[PDB]
Design a protein around this ligand. Structure first.
Ligand SMILES: [K+]
Ligand SMILES: [K+]
Ligand SMILES: [K+]
Ligand SMILES: [K+]
Ligand SMILES: [K+]
Ligand SMILES: [K+]
Ligand SMILES: [K+]
Ligand SMILES: [K+]
Ligand SMILES: [Mg+2]
Ligand SMILES: [Mg+2]
Ligand SMILES: [Mg+2]
Ligand SMILES: [Mg+2]
Ligand SMILES: [Mg+2]
Ligand SMILES: [Mg+2]
Ligand SMILES: [Mg+2]
Ligand SMILES: [Mg+2]
Ligand SMILES: [Mg+2]
Ligand SMILES: [Mg+2]
Ligand SMILES: [Mg+2]
Ligand SMILES: [Mg+2]
Ligand SMILES: [Mg+2]
Ligand SMILES: [Mg+2]
Ligand SMILES: [Mg+2]
Ligand SMILES: [Mg+2]
Ligand SMILES: [Mg+2]
Ligand SMILES: [Mg+2]
Ligand SMILES: [Mg+2]
Ligand SMILES: [Mg+2]
Ligand SMILES: [Mg+2]
Ligand SMILES: [Mg+2]
Ligand SMILES: [Mg+2]
Ligand SMILES: [Mg+2]
Ligand SMILES: [Mg+2]
Ligand SMILES: [Mg+2]
Ligand SMILES: [Mg+2]
Ligand SMILES: [Mg+2]
Ligand SMILES: [Mg+2]
Lengths: 68, 50, 101, 89, 106
RNA sequence: CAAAUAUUCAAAUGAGAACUUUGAAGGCCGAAGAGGAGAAAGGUUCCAUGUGAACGGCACUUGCACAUGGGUAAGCCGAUC
RNA sequence: GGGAUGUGGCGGUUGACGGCGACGUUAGGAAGUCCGGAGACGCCGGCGGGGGCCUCGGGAAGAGUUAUCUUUUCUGCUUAACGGCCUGCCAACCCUGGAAACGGUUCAGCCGGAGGUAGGGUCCAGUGGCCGGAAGAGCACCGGGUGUCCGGUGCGCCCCCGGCGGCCCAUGAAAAUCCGGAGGACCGCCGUUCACGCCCGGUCGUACUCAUAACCGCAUCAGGUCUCCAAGGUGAACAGCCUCUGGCCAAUGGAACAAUGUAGGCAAGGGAAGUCGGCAAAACGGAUCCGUAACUUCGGGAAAAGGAU
């Protein structure tokens, strides 16, 4: 497993062809976005409520999205 | 042991099949003299030296 | 700050098993504060009453597990420990309550 | 102090005889001594094995005596070899 | 106190069977098998450690398993000779070569 | 039929209980153990269900016995090099 | 690990940059030939570090005791490989500088004009920290919900590591495998040990016992048979004795206490008179203080002996 820091790098990874699904995990602190790729699971931590929503709406329409 | 050669396991399988009672219908045959297996082995007695 | 722990005895009195006045009185006589003598009733710890719940409050540090120890002792002293148990309230973590088995 | 005559040989206790302990004393002392390194100029040469003498700091290793760095005949042999080499010329 | 067992069929405390105790998220203790301590690269002329390279088992240095910066040092005789050894060889190579010319002239 | 401290009570099951099962109590091993796992060696003794006799040097409803079935999954543990 | 294949990146001063330097950065030519390292190694003794365990306290959850006392006793309160960043022990190395009125320094050592102390750095390893994995799991409670937290200590125990010292007429494997290097023949739209991406991974073993009943001793035989883990108290202590986890009451049962046995004790007064013979038993015993002869190979004798607590 690997962590992603900036939002844009998560955007390109979720747009990868080998990306299969995105899991959204809600914690009491932040919101974790996990995209399952071929070799690694990439996790990005969003500490902002609206940035989580903007990320949710701006995801690629072709990728599956799951709520955890 | 747990660590077995294949050739030892194959022989152990045959010896497992061979120690069964004789079928009951064998005793009903026309000229039958067989009573029991005469070759049953129990593991605690009569070890097979492999 | 002002630490407050409250024992909720709502059910036991609606079924007339014990009396919260005896519970409150048991608490004022058997509380040691700041490592002093038992039931000294200093200026810090105070015990107040309601119709159903007894409230303990102090300006120093008070351990909630001490209140549970004193409540269970009171239940044995008045022969209700078999029928009642002290349970932390799901809603609030500064609150106990008495529940039937 | 701790002993009037035994010294290093007191590790052997009362065993093996007084004459044998006195015999082994000189070689026990000499084989555990620190010798001068001609290459670097320090008293850092220690016996690594019988005949092998290594300096701690400069790292030179030298073939020498069994229990002393230079045997007496080694000096005599070197002088004979040196005189033969010069007189050869 | 949660005594432990070996997890494979090696029953003897050999150097290749060394274990460590770890706590799992299951709240228990299990054995994990470790790797034997290995020397790193060594210098043949000084005997000292070669700086800049980790101390691993030989097959953990494999190219597919280790990055190139970790494997090498950027200097002639990089992972083979230390800096002091390389300085001495350069100076010896040049100074003896000058002596060869002086021998030729004289 | 006497080494290795030791059993007791109530209930259940069963033709039959000092010896099976459950609960309670009293004790022992005392962690270089009478605990938990392996290498040799064994080879089905492992698990379930059932029980004529024999066997378990007293007994048994019970089993390391007997009968009928079931059970051992690897690119990473090993062999293999 | 192997095999195919792109997309992106990287280099062409043909074969990259940075750093005084130690060295750093995910990439960043190359054939025959040659060179080095790792693998790769004994025993003993201190010291230091990390992990686990034990142990003291606080908080919260549940349970035990409760005539009296007990802010109490008990249980649990967890975090894997793998990846990134940080840290950077003890050694080792680098740069500046130039030391006697010598200094630095260990439990011990030992170190310094062949460059110390000092100042500033590089690397090394970790079973170290944080994040991802990962709370969604596991556990404990309450009826879906709550919580999964904060400290302290050490000649403690087990494992591993580090770094010193000692010892030898004893110096304590090899090979497969992997990495690095020297050289530079040869070569330009061709090179690429980089990232991401695609496919594949054979055969045989695997149950169970490992022993006062699964092995050998003709047996379900008080014998014999190689290992790992290992808690609390007392105590110097893996001694003995008691306890927790876990495991067991399987060793035919009942009645009664004759002789003689077997195993274990005591016995007034005497104290080896017993017997081939003090055989057997009894006496002594830990720790602290005092004190300790002849003889001696000068090392011992010695815990001599003898007293006190
Ligand atoms: K390097
Ligand atoms: K295999
Ligand atoms: K070896
Ligand atoms: K691993
Ligand atoms: K298995
Ligand atoms: K046995
Ligand atoms: K008798
Ligand atoms: K006598
Ligand atoms: Mg047998
Ligand atoms: Mg035969
Ligand atoms: Mg007898
Ligand atoms: Mg019995
Ligand atoms: Mg005992
Ligand atoms: Mg006991
Ligand atoms: Mg078992
Ligand atoms: Mg069975
Ligand atoms: Mg019988
Ligand atoms: Mg059978
Ligand atoms: Mg393997
Ligand atoms: Mg010694
Ligand atoms: Mg300094
Ligand atoms: Mg995490
Ligand atoms: Mg949970
Ligand atoms: Mg041990
Ligand atoms: Mg080259
Ligand atoms: Mg042990
Ligand atoms: Mg003690
Ligand atoms: Mg003990
Ligand atoms: Mg018997
Ligand atoms: Mg009897
Ligand atoms: Mg007498
Ligand atoms: Mg007398
Ligand atoms: Mg006499
Ligand atoms: Mg006589
Ligand atoms: Mg006589
Ligand atoms: Mg005697
Ligand atoms: Mg004497």
């Amino acid at each position: 497993p690997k962590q992603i820091h900036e939002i844009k790098d998560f955007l390109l990874t979720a747009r990868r062809k080998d990306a299969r699904s995105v899991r959204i995990k809600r914690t009491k602190d932040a919101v974790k976005f996990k995209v399952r790729c071929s070799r690694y699971l990439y996790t990005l931590c969003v500490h902002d409520t609206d940035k989580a929503n903007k990320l949710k709406q701006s995801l690629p329409p072709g990728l599956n999205v799951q709520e955890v | 042991p747990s660590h077995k050669t294949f050739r030892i396991k194959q022989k152990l399988a045959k010896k497992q099949r061979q120690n069964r009672p004789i079928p009951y219908w064998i005793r009903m045959r026309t000229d039958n003299t067989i009573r029991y297996n005469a070759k049953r082995r129990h593991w605690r007695r009569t070890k097979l030296g492999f | 700050g002002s630490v407050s722990f409250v024992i909720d005895c709502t059910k036991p009195v609606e079924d007339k098993i014990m009396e919260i006045a005896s519970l409150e009185k048991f608490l004022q006589e058997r509380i040691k504060v700041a490592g002093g003598k038992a039931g000294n009733l200093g200026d810090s710890v105070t015990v107040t009453r309601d119709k159903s719940k007894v409230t303990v409050t102090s300006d120093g540090a008070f351990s909630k597990r001490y209140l549970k120890y004193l409540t269970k002792k009171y239940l044995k002293k008045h022969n209700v420990r078999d029928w009642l148990r002290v349970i932390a309230a799901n809603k609030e973590r500064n609150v106990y309550e008495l529940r039937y088995f | 102090k701790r002993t009037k005559k035994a010294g290093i040989v007191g590790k052997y206790g009362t065993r093996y005889g007084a004459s044998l302990r006195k015999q082994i004393k000189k070689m026990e002392v000499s084989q555990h001594s620190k010798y001068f390194c001609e290459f670097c100029g320090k008293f850092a040469v220690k016996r690594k094995a019988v005949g092998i003498w290594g300096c701690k700091d400069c790292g030179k290793v030298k073939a020498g005596g069994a229990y002393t760095m230079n045997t007496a005949s080694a000096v005599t042999v070197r002088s004979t070899i040196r005189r033969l080499r010069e007189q050869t010329e | 106190v949660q005594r432990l067992t070996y997890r494979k069929r090696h029953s003897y405390a050999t150097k290749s069977n060394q274990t460590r105790v770890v706590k799992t998220p299951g709240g228990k203790l299990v054995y994990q098998y470790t790797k034997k301590r290995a020397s790193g690269p060594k210098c043949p002329v000084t005997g000292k450690k070669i700086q800049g390279i980790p101390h691993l088992r030989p097959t953990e240095y494999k190219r597919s398993r280790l990055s190139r910066n970790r494997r090498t040092v950027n200097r002639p005789y990089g992972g083979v000779l230390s800096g002091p050894a390389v300085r001495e060889r350069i100076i010896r190579a040049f100074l003896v070569e000058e002596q060869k010319i002086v021998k030729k002239v004289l």
